[PDB]
Write a protein that binds this ligand. Structure first.
Ligand SMILES: Cc1ccnc2c1NC(=O)c1cccnc1N2C1CC1
Ligand SMILES: O=c1c(C2CCCC2)c(O)c2cccnc2n1O
Ligand SMILES: [Mn+2]
Ligand SMILES: [Mn+2]
Lengths: 400, 554
């Protein structure tokens, strides 16, 4: 039997254009899809199906990545407020969290007949020489948020013995992945993961290691300097001025008294000591979490990323601007685009671990550059939503 | 003419909609007679069939002119028919095709009429030939085949051909077939003997599936005219482009000129369009005569010289790398060529786009590279190796220091002037022994009046009144003032992040004349340090300009 799936009232399926693919990725997709077709997982379709979802190939074994972002938006009522999967608050506290790909489970469960048409995708040809090869899914597809929603009861049955035997191990499912957290010593944790893999193996389904307890704040750093120039203090008060917009109780009044009258920038001026009460107690609030800022589950998460140079990247996650839920950094034969894709993936998994959802990214890159290159370095089975923005000039050095 | 024995494609109406019921308009006797003759012949061919008055659906028919033809107005049925998958997401570019020994065109006789329509959808295609005046009930027909002008016909015909060609393709994998509407293009590297024999195997395979094709004496000879191209199995070019020599140029004539030149730029190197396009901005009616600007005349003359001799492109060899070279033609204008063997171009092209109000040549070059990179993946399924008129050092410096991420595929420097460079740079550190200017602007949004000025560490001062201005313009004006009156080395402090952002990106060209005036001053300078401070925080010099420029404004 199949569980009936319906779209959000008043809207129909995705009609997203297939992006241009390289020669090697088309050939890889053709091999993958020919094999899936033989196994009955997908079937060729006719032109009476007007729907499309983009498809990509990622990595030594080639794998298919279907971009269901649009279908997921149009089925949100189903996987969120009909068959929603709860997110545990304990996962982010764990000493170790292991990510296991569990997507192979989904092809054993048939997809609802009347929904199969919305899963339509195309393998394009080079230079539009031949019509695209068109398919739809017969089974729960990887990348669709409805899949873990439907498989939910089957996964519970699979994990039951392991969860009973290991009550202090947190297991969380998000899309194609299983997130497994414990406070055990690393050797014991890895032994328990292997144990879990054996349970999964008996059901067919078949890692990546995180340490969330060591995720600490990225504080705005004020410079310790001996001998300040006029330019140095101007840069300092500007950093503090913006810092006060996010942190409740940052003062800068004493520092500004040093800059009175029209002075040359290279003029070295000695500091008083009335400013040290500000300077030192500013560092106190800067190292601590923001008071009054909490995650609202009814609001989207937004992630901003700044390129800092030297292979370093700063990022902030918020829902209302200035109200940072999390800040951090990413550090590195690595190019700008490769580093950015890696950072996006890193920020996304942290976001999955902490809140149980992905942020919408504001990327400091040209749209077309990102679109041609991102799959070359992408390794995750999900895809976050993204915007393309112009990094404001001073946000960079303020988070430096 | 046969009807293909292939499986039918199931068709539906749009959800919540029923079939069309638009009534038949009375026709003249001669039109009715003409329709009756056409419809009885179509009925004998199996294309249409008689139906009774139990069918509630109707689509109007019309007769148009020695011979007559029948027009079925499917507007109402099309509106009610489901959406289909698109017939194609793009067309092949000739540059991406591989060289063949022989290529033959085969057209399908009466394309749509040779493929059956879904039996359960046939009732919705009903039409009525009206009787003379009102009197008699009309003659009612429905379609058995894909109707001309119906929404689903293009896609269902293509899908049918794909299924028909599939067996033949699989057992003849080294023969290339391209489907285009009712045409088939068939190429191979077989000897002239077994190529003509191979076409006959295809023709018999197609005839087996109810599709008739022309024989050796009827099929066209190369070059084939297709989609504005002229195609040999050995080379390709654009179709004959003739620039008219006119005394007076109308908007319509210039629009058509630009269209032709744009089309030509695919294979004719160095084609320019900028000056001709400038003539078409905010332009009047199509019949309006536009006097040719002197720059437009020179551009036209350069284009005529380029198009003087015929030029062809070569085809693609998948065993060799693609090489893309780019040259700067002038401000905003870029041109490129793609080849595999030095200077035998597969195709050419141009880039001009202005991404953002203010830019430099380094940014434009990268934008050009990304445009060509995308084009290359579409056409050849791979990226080319680039040869660019920019030093590795210049490129290195820019990318590292800029806020935006980028990646250019493998590229080499090539000494083809003009070389890409930055025309100035901002200091990392404040200058010792240089005058420090504090700048600010203020604008009144009611009156659009404003002031721009500066105060300096050396007690210098100036304010200039402006009349139709904005906040942003006054901040730029203030910075421009500071540059004008400063001398070779300057420290400038602004509270405008907008102004800071523009200048830090080292622009060499802008849509604003004011920014261009700033750029001109920045190049003349020896050393410039531009710093930012927050507005209204009691910062010495900054507070002094603010009071100065806000006086009488806010
Ligand atoms: C119109 C068209 C578009 C796409 N491909 C082709 C053609 N026609 C050609 O004449 C042609 C030229 C050379 C090689 N391939 C060609 N063919 C390929 C099919 C044999
Ligand atoms: O006077 C202002 C004000 C004032 C007008 C309203 C109060 C502050 C600004 O906000 C401001 C913001 C960016 C750059 N320059 C600015 N200036 O010059
Ligand atoms: Mn200002
Ligand atoms: Mn001001």
């Amino acid at each position: 039997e199949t569980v009936p799936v319906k779209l959000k009232p008043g809207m129909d399926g995705p009609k997203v254009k297939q992006w241009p693919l390289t020669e090697e990725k088309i050939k890889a997709l053709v091999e993958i899809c020919t094999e899936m077709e033989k196994e009955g997982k997908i079937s060729k379709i006719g032109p009476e199906n007007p729907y499309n979802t983009p498809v990509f190939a990622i990595k030594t074994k080639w794998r298919k990545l279907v971009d269901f972002r649009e279908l997921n938006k149009r089925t949100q009522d189903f996987w969120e407020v009909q068959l929603g999967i709860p997110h545990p608050a304990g996962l982010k506290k764990n000493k170790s969290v292991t990510v296991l790909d569990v997507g192979d489970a989904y092809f054993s469960v048939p997809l609802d007949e009347d929904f199969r048409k919305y899963t339509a995708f195309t393998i394009p040809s080079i230079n539009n020489e031949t019509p695209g090869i068109r398919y739809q899914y017969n089974v729960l597809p990887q990348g669709w948020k409805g899949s873990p929603a439907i498989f939910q009861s089957s996964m519970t049955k699979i994990l039951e013995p392991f969860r009973k035997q290991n009550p202090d191990i947190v297991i969380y499912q998000y899309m194609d992945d299983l997130y497994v957290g414990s406070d055990l010593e690393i050797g014991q944790h890895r032994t328990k993961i292997e144990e879990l893999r054996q349970h999964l193996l008996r059901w067919g389904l078949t890692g990546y290691e995180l340490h969330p307890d060591k995720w600490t704040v990225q504080p705005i750093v004020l410079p310790e300097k001996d001998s300040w120039t006029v330019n140095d203090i101007q840069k300092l008060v500007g950093k503090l001025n913006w810092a006060s917009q996010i942190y409740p109780g940052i003062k800068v009044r004493q520092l500004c008294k040093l800059l009175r009258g029209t002075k040359a920038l290279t003029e070295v001026i000695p500091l008083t000591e009335e400013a040290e009460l500000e300077l030192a107690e500013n560092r106190e609030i800067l190292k601590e979490p923001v008071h009054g800022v909490y995650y609202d589950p009814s609001k989207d998460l937004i992630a901003e990323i700044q390129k800092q140079g030297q292979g370093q990247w700063t990022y902030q996650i918020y829902q209302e601007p200035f109200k940072n839920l999390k800040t951090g950094k990413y550090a590195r034969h690595t190019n700008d685009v490769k580093q950015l894709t890696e950072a996006v993936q890193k920020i996304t998994t942290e976001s999955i671990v902490i809140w149980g959802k992905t942020p919408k990214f504001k990327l400091p890159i040209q749209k077309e550059t990102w679109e041609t290159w991102w799959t070359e370095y992408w390794q995750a089975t999900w895809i976050p939503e993204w915007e393309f923005v112009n990094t404001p000039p001073l946000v960079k050095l303020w988070y430096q | 003419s046969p009807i293909s024995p292939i499986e039918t494609v199931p068709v539906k109406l749009k959800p919540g909609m029923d079939g069309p019921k638009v009534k038949q308009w009375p026709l003249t006797e001669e039109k009715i007679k003409a329709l009756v003759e056409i419809c009885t012949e179509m009925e004998k061919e199996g294309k249409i069939s008689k139906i009774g008055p139990e069918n509630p659906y109707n689509t109007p028919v019309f007769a148009i002119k020695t011979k007559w033809r029948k027009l079925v107005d499917f507007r109402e049925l099309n509106k009610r028919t489901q959406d289909f998958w698109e017939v194609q997401l793009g067309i092949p570019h000739p540059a991406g095709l591989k060289k063949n020994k022989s290529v033959t065109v085969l057209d399908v006789g009466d394309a749509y009429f040779s493929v059956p329509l879904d039996e359960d959808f046939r009732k919705y295609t009903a039409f009525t030939i009206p009787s003379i005046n009102n009197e008699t009930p009309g003659i009612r027909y429905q379609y058995n085949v894909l109707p001309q002008g119906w929404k689903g016909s293009p896609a269902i015909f293509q899908s049918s051909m794909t299924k028909i060609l599939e067996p033949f393709r699989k057992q003849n994998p080294d023969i290339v077939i391209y489907q285009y509407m009712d045409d088939l293009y068939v190429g191979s590297d077989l000897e002239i003997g077994q190529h003509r024999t191979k076409i006959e195997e295809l023709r018999q395979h197609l005839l087996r599936w109810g599709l008739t094709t022309p024989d050796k004496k009827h099929q066209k000879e190369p070059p084939f005219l297709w989609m504005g191209y002229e195609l040999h199995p050995d080379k390709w070019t654009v179709q004959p482009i003739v620039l008219p020599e006119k005394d007076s140029w109308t908007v319509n004539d210039i629009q058509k000129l630009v269209g032709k030149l744009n089309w030509a730029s695919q294979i004719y190197p160095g084609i320019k369009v900028r000056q001709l396009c400038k003539l078409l901005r905010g332009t009047k009616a199509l019949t309006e005569v536009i006097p040719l600007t002197e720059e437009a005349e020179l551009e036209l003359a350069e284009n005529r010289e380029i198009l003087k001799e015929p030029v062809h492109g070569v085809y693609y060899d998948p065993s060799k790398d693609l090489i893309a070279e780019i040259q700067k033609q002038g401000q905003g204008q870029w041109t490129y060529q793609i080849y595999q063997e030095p200077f035998k171009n597969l195709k050419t092209g141009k880039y001009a786009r202005m991404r953002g109000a203010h830019t430099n040549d380094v940014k434009q070059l990268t934008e050009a590279v990304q445009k060509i990179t995308t084009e290359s993946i579409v056409i050849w399924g791979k990226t080319p190796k680039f040869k660019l008129p920019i030093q590795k050092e210049t490129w290195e410096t820019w990318w590292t220091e800029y806020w935006q991420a980028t990646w250019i595929p493998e590229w080499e420097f090539v000494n083809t002037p003009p070389l890409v460079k930055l025309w100035y740079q901002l200091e990392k550190e404040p200058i010792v022994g240089a005058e420090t200017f504090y700048v600010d602007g203020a604008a009144n949004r009611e009156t659009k009046l404003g002031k721009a000025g500066y105060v300096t560490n050396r007690g210098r001062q100036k304010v200039v009144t402006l009349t139709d201005t904005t906040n942003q313009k006054t901040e730029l004006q203030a910075i421009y003032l500071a540059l004008q009156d400063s001398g070779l080395e300057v420290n400038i402090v602004t509270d405008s992040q907008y102004a800071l952002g523009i200048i830090q990106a080292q622009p060499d060209q802008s849509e604003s004349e004011l920014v261009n005036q700033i750029i001109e001053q920045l190049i003349k300078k020896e050393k410039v340090y531009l710093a930012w401070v927050p507005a209204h925080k009691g910062i010495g010099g900054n507070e002094q300009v603010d009071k100065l420029v806000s006086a009488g404004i806010r």
